[PDB]
Amino acid sequence: MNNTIINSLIDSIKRSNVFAVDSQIPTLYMPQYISLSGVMTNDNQAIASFEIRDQYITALNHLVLSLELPEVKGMGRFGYVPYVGYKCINHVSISSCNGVIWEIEGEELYNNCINNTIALKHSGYSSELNDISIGLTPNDTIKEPSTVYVYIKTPFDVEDTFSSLKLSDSKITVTVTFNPVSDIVIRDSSFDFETFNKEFVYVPELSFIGYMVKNVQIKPSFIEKPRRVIGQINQPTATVTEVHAATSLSVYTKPYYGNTDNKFISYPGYSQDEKDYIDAYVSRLLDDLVIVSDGPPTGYPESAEIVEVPEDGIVSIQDADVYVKIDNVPDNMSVYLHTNLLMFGTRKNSFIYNISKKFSAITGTYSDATKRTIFAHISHSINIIDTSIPVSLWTSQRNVYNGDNRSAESKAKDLFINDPFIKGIDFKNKTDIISRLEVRFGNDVLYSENGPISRIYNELLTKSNNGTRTLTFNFTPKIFFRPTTITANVSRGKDKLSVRVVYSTMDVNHPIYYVQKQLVVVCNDLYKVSYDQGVSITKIM
Amino acid sequence: AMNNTIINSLSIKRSNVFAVDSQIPTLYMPQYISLSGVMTNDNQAIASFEIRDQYITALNHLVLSLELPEVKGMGRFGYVPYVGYKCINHVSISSCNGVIWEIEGEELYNNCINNTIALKHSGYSSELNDISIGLTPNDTIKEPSTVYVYIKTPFDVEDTFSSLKLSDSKITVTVTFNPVSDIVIRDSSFDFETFNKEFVYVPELSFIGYMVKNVQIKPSFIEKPRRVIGQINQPTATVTEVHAATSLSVYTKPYYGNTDNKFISYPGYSQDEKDYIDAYVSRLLDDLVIVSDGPPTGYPESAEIVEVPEDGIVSIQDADVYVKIDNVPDNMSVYLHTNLLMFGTRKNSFIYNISKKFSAITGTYSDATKRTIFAHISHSINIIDTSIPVSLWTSQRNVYNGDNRSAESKAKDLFINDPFIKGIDFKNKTDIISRLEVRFGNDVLYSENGPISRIYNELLTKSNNGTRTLTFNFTPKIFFRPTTITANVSRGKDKLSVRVVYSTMDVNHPIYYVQKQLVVVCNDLYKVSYDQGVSITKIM
Amino acid sequence: IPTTENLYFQGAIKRSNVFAVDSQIPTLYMPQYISLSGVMTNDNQAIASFEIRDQYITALNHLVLSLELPEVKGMGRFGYVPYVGYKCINHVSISSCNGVIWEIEGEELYNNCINNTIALKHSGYSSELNDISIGLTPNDTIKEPSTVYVYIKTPFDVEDTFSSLKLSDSKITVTVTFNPVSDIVIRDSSFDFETFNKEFVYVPELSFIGYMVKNVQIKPSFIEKPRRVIGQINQPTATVTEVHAATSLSVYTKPYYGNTDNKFISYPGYSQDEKDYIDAYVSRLLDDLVIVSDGPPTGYPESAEIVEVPEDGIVSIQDADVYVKIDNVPDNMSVYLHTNLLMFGTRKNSFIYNISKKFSAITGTYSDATKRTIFAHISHSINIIDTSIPVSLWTSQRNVYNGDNRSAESKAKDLFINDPFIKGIDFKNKTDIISRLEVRFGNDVLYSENGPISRIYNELLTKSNNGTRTLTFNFTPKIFFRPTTITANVSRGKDKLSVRVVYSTMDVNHPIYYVQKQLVVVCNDLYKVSYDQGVSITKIM
Numbered sequence A: 001m002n003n004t005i006i007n008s009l010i011d012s013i014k015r016s017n018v019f020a021v022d023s024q025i026p027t028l029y030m031p032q033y034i035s036l037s038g039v040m041t042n043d044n045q046a047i048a049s050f051e052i053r054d055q056y057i058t059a060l061n062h063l064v065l066s067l068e069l070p071e072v073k074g075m076g077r078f079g080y081v082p083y084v085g086y087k088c089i090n091h092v093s094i095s096s097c098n099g100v101i102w103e104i105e106g107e108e109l110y111n112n113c114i115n116n117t118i119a120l121k122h123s124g125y126s127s128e129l130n131d132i133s134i135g136l137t138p139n140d141t142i143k144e145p146s147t148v149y150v151y152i153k154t155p156f157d158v159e160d161t162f163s164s165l166k167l168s169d170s171k172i173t174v175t176v177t178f179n180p181v182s183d184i185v186i187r188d189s190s191f192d193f194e195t196f197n198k199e200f201v202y203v204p205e206l207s208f209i210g211y212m213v214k215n216v217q218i219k220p221s222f223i224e225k226p227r228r229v230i231g232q233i234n235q236p237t238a239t240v241t242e243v244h245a246a247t248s249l250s251v252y253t254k255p256y257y258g259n260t261d262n263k264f265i266s267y268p269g270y271s272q273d274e275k276d277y278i279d280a281y282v283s284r285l286l287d288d289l290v291i292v293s294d295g296p297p298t299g300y301p302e303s304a305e306i307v308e309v310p311e312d313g314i315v316s317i318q319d320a321d322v323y324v325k326i327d328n329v330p331d332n333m334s335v336y337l338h339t340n341l342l343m344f345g346t347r348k349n350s351f352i353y354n355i356s357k358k359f360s361a362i363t364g365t366y367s368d369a370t371k372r373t374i375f376a377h378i379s380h381s382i383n384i385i386d387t388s389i390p391v392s393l394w395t396s397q398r399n400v401y402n403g404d405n406r407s408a409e410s411k412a413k414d415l416f417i418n419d420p421f422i423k424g425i426d427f428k429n430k431t432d433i434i435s436r437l438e439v440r441f442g443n444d445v446l447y448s449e450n451g452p453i454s455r456i457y458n459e460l461l462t463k464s465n466n467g468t469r470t471l472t473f474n475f476t477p478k479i480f481f482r483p484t485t486i487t488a489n490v491s492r493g494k495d496k497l498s499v500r501v502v503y504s505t506m507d508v509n510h511p512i513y514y515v516q517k518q519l520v521v522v523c524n525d526l527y528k529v530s531y532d533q534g535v536s537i538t539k540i541m
Numbered sequence B: 001a002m003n004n005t006i007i008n009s010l011s012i013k014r015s016n017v018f019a020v021d022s023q024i025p026t027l028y029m030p031q032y033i034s035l036s037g038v039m040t041n042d043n044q045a046i047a048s049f050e051i052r053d054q055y056i057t058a059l060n061h062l063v064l065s066l067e068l069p070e071v072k073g074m075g076r077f078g079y080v081p082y083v084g085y086k087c088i089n090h091v092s093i094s095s096c097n098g099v100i101w102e103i104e105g106e107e108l109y110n111n112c113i114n115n116t117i118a119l120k121h122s123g124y125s126s127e128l129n130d131i132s133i134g135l136t137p138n139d140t141i142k143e144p145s146t147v148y149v150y151i152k153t154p155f156d157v158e159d160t161f162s163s164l165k166l167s168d169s170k171i172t173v174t175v176t177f178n179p180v181s182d183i184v185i186r187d188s189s190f191d192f193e194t195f196n197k198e199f200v201y202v203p204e205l206s207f208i209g210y211m212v213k214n215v216q217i218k219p220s221f222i223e224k225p226r227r228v229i230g231q232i233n234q235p236t237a238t239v240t241e242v243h244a245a246t247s248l249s250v251y252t253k254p255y256y257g258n259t260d261n262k263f264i265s266y267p268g269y270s271q272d273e274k275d276y277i278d279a280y281v282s283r284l285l286d287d288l289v290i291v292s293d294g295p296p297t298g299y300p301e302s303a304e305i306v307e308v309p310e311d312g313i314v315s316i317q318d319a320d321v322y323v324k325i326d327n328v329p330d331n332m333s334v335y336l337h338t339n340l341l342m343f344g345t346r347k348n349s350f351i352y353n354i355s356k357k358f359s360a361i362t363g364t365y366s367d368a369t370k371r372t373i374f375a376h377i378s379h380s381i382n383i384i385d386t387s388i389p390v391s392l393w394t395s396q397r398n399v400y401n402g403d404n405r406s407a408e409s410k411a412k413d414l415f416i417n418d419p420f421i422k423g424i425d426f427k428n429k430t431d432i433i434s435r436l437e438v439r440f441g442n443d444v445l446y447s448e449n450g451p452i453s454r455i456y457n458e459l460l461t462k463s464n465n466g467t468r469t470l471t472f473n474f475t476p477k478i479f480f481r482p483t484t485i486t487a488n489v490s491r492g493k494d495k496l497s498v499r500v501v502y503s504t505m506d507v508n509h510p511i512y513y514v515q516k517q518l519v520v521v522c523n524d525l526y527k528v529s530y531d532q533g534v535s536i537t538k539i540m
Numbered sequence C: 001i002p003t004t005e006n007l008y009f010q011g012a013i014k015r016s017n018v019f020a021v022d023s024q025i026p027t028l029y030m031p032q033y034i035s036l037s038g039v040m041t042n043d044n045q046a047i048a049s050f051e052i053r054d055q056y057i058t059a060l061n062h063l064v065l066s067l068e069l070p071e072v073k074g075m076g077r078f079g080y081v082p083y084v085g086y087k088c089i090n091h092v093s094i095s096s097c098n099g100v101i102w103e104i105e106g107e108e109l110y111n112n113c114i115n116n117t118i119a120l121k122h123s124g125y126s127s128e129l130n131d132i133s134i135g136l137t138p139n140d141t142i143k144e145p146s147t148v149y150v151y152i153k154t155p156f157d158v159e160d161t162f163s164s165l166k167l168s169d170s171k172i173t174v175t176v177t178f179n180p181v182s183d184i185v186i187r188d189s190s191f192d193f194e195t196f197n198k199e200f201v202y203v204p205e206l207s208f209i210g211y212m213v214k215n216v217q218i219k220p221s222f223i224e225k226p227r228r229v230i231g232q233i234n235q236p237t238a239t240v241t242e243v244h245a246a247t248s249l250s251v252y253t254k255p256y257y258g259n260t261d262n263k264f265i266s267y268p269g270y271s272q273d274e275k276d277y278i279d280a281y282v283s284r285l286l287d288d289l290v291i292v293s294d295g296p297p298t299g300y301p302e303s304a305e306i307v308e309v310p311e312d313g314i315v316s317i318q319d320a321d322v323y324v325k326i327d328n329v330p331d332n333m334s335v336y337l338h339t340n341l342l343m344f345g346t347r348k349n350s351f352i353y354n355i356s357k358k359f360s361a362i363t364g365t366y367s368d369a370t371k372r373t374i375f376a377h378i379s380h381s382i383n384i385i386d387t388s389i390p391v392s393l394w395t396s397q398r399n400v401y402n403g404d405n406r407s408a409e410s411k412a413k414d415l416f417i418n419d420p421f422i423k424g425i426d427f428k429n430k431t432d433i434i435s436r437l438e439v440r441f442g443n444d445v446l447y448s449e450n451g452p453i454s455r456i457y458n459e460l461l462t463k464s465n466n467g468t469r470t471l472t473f474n475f476t477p478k479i480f481f482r483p484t485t486i487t488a489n490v491s492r493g494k495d496k497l498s499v500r501v502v503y504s505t506m507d508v509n510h511p512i513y514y515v516q517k518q519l520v521v522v523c524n525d526l527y528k529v530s531y532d533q534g535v536s537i538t539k540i541m
């Protein structure tokens, strides 16, 4: 230590000790990780029930659901959706003999864990699970058996032991409803889904941190329970009734693919970036987009317009110019460009949405050894929306053209995607289709915004990179304080939350226009956690 | 079920760790409030936001929205990474009694540098930061976008507890903006003259407002940052009237006022050290290795383009460059530019040559596109090379021509005016400080050779890009009165004098001529009193 | 119609103040960053002693050890292990005149900092340090001199000034024992390690945050000291004796490479992902795997089976088919495939583990200019285990075949890896080799598991992606509360923690089977910090 600091200190005011503290004796307890097998029940929806009844387990928290993924054998393309564990959850319910204590919808549990990288990884996020593997023979192993762990985040984990679920000498039932296996699987037509669906069984195990407490001093607390309201298809409104004490309100959009066969051209697999989705789509198209053939290429529909690339290299599709230059092309062969690989239009001789027009430069070298074109660099304007268009909409009734002018080989490689937690109108939820949000508490306008400033606040306040337009009414510390809520006024009709959105106007000649939307409104109501005590007499009969 | 061993294991006063009394908080109601400002115009843009409402009792979490316009026309254009923070010059929160809290643009950015989410919202995408090209005068270079800048204040530390209370006073939030030149990376082709004339800052301030029923206001303490920028290249800077300081930060900034702010390359959205280097290598390669029918044309007379021998090795003095290109036509030969960029202060002395920084170049010539497709490059190019302004290659100090590149390459040079660059390179990799000496009055307060104060700053703040910082306060904020370095007016200990020893560079290296500026940041303690409106008082 | 009401707060007793707090006056103190040079001692093991003796250093925390890495000159391949700073630490000991206050093993300090990205970076994680650099001339600079910073995390940093180590007018000694330089260096046979080991010296400097406190009010506290027990080689048990008050128990595996020369085929350098390890291995093998030669290739052992690739492109190695197609092959030359690059078999008529059979497609273009094959795309089933096999195990006595059928050029590029902190049986600790864990407190079974649910909990509760099978007993916030421990019953015999694992069964014909294992058990015991007659620690019993 230098002299200047010594002189600065070398009087007597009431000071708080910042260099020592009294190590308070905590409640005498003992934790233990407890694992239990359930009871399976079977629209023949799979339901697992876990009963927790023990004199020693005083309190419990940190629920983790294990799932045994079986060995997948056979032919065809198969892969699991990212975070497979969360995606196979439809509903989680924690109940006692008095009724439901806390419950959540599958998507909401996922939304609550979206900022937890570790919980998402344990759930099932690997190249082993999420890459689309191919089976060549009926006995070939597509996927090896694996175990996934789903962190069932509850309000009891917030402040560890302080927030824990205290079993007041009663039975606790944890009920897990599962989504059909079709929701968690990405497969092609070649894959035998019918056999798989029948043969597949959900193999769960519930784990939790149990606490054996000596002379526990139980006190009443407060809990936030989530409620979900899904609006009418393509309707820009949704209402949450009986709102008396709400801590938060979330608003988001979901696509509805019930009007399609849920088939999509491409899928990136484990690689989940916006660029990864785009690159996978470009790769799938390139095979049919630029062809090196001896004369006019064969195997394409009559509707297809495959033009020979001039010496200039530029092929003009209306106003759009495509520069195609392939090296080491054999003298007997020529370079061809598919000028209408995928096209859409609602009126004859009108605006046409052509996927071939979304390319500006294609360069590569022809391989004599593999009889394939090895593409070097592609200049395109392909977006996340293009990769998110269901194949059905290209060949829909609304289209005046054939639509899908790809080869039968390409069409056979299309994958079924039935992920239950998709948001917006694209796989990455990039496109914001809400131009204005209006929240009304009864007749009075509670909140309005054009830009997603509520989403920006949600992302900041929750340290999340994928948030939703959320209104937070509670800025008080949880567990130690009674949560602040938006309070109702039944007499003035201020007992409901009415959400109204203004959807972005889309072009009728773009296939995304026909993707149906659903408004999702999530409300977190406040409940009081009480512990029933008293004497009851019963007539012996 | 619980096992027998744990059961067997289980008058003393014990604290309840399994239950707590859910305390009734102060009755309040939060609301996200958004306001439009008042624009004022060296004709510097200033946005004023006035906050006053009988129901807005307190506020925190200031977020500034910015409407980036559609950019149309010809040329290369892109935004600097974290565009939102970069366009902020100064933020000032004041009342009728004066300024409550204020910050310089760079300091606000420095405070949010460890916040990934805040940085992303600010504007960090391929859509904004990649250098896009406009082909026709009506072509859209950049689509309109909205960016969100988190104005981190001392009021967010402990949420409602730390929040700024409004004692029936008018709170003004003043945002001074940097010129649009600082947030834009563009080439000569881009019509910046029209862009600068037509561009307008479109701001909107958002904050979390609180309606508090019967608020019980108490006095608090606030840390306000002060910045002192030293004389260009001067290894000294002094902070006067230091009476109660919580911290002191020291860093360096480059100065490019002696250049045209033009640089050869830029990686765009990809911001790693390797990304900067790879972009530079890519830009030089087409001029470095030429496949031509006879001696290549279009280069200055000063250029020394040598034909690559059958051996493949071209010797530039002591440096050997292996150049081997596949599928070269019979009528054409492989050439190496042996002096692409050169610098020297004397005619027969040491030369800094960029071509000598290459050891192996391999590729395949494309007959279809008439260009060389490079496979693998072995080089010793560093982050400093990518950070040299073009002006320094053709400077007066240089005995050589300097820039022996083609007119095509020179036309692709980009103007970079990022206001928050640190050190002498874009990634602030090179540490140019050999010694730090901090004096309080006349006495040496702290002395260091290695950047151990930076290592402590990075550890204690969980940041990967920190500064040489002396922290005097290790006491928890809000709940305690901050610990400070106290002054002695009588003894003369009322100023912080920083003296550095810059590491000396080679005069024959162009980086030597990059001007430096020493930045000293001091955080003074102020008392916040709500008697007769909101007012701050300097602890002395 | 476009107008929407802009109204504020449209949703409106002893109360705790949530909008204001009393700014308590703290203890009068002054911090200072203090740096000290040590005293080097030399089994000739390196030991650095730092004596802290000052009447004004009242308390201290945040220990940071600086290390001056020298300029590395000469020929051969050389690079440092990632996080070089932590890897050179063997043991850290903080002691006073009364004895040891706190101490840690090198690996445990690293384990405690594994979730701290910043601390790991400061330690030495750069392309400059970790990439394997090559020296061409005896005076060529391989590595430039560098300074690394090792954050010696102690229990005194938990609650900053509150948790800080107080110096009761006593001399505090910080002793740092260093691992041999062999442990922190990755080099080939060409590199003169004999001279390097002789010329290398550890150049340390200890830094800490010292606090000069005016009228300090010292109070007794509690400290957790880690204890490590390493089981006998290939022994599935390990016991921790005298367990009286433990806060946690960690169990993990380590490989033992003493039965090998510590040489490995490949190393990715700075790039440390699972894919980076795999890609580096594939790259190293490709040079010998696919050969473009004028007639049968030379330089390989007689044991090697190099087959000419047919016009078909398919080379069949038993039931495995390898598609090899190289472009621009000269007319005087042919394409060859090494069908047994690396092979292992316990019997002559048994299952043979062949690395060449792990490849399905190899495509590239031959360069006439550089006389090399430039590989475009490789389809393989190479895993993290393959990259983790020591070269010695390919040519071991157990193998009835030659094993290593690579060229002398490839074999000369093999690197010595002596990283002291490797876990599991692979470099990334991906493969879980424990099928069952049994923890006993005395003779009674305390905890048993099949799946790694204790590791899943460790990873969740500590927000770490690289955790260990850990049993936590303390769920109470440190420093404010007295830590909750598993208490002993000396009379009943429960005064020891006995761990037992059941290793997952591997195939005898796979070289990984012969990688020897060591069980590591870490126990954190509770000690009382008493400041009567200087600083001293007492074991809670």
Ligand SMILES: CO[C@H]1/C=C/O[C@@]2(C)Oc3c(C)c(O)c4c(c3C2=O)C2=NC3(CCN(CC(C)C)CC3)NC2=C(NC(=O)/C(C)=C\C=C\[C@H](C)[C@H](O)[C@@H](C)[C@@H](O)[C@@H](C)[C@H](OC(C)=O)[C@@H]1C)C4=O
Pocket: A016, A021, A477, A480, B020, B158, B161, B476, B479, C159, C162, C477, C479, C480
């Ligand atoms: C909402 O929760 C709050 C408490 C109530 O919850 C209670 C009911 O459960 C607690 C739990 C679970 C705790 O772990 C602590 C306390 C309490 C409670 O009382 C403390 N209670 C006191 C007891 C003594 N008084 C007065 C005086 C003598 C100093 C102060 C509080 N100190 C306390 C601590 N800290 C210390 O002693 C030490 C060794 C250091 C403290 C440093 C600073 C000061 C804190 O870091 C500060 C930022 C803190 O306020 C937040 C971490 C948080 O507050 C918020 C708003 O976020 C609390 C956890 C605790 O660790």
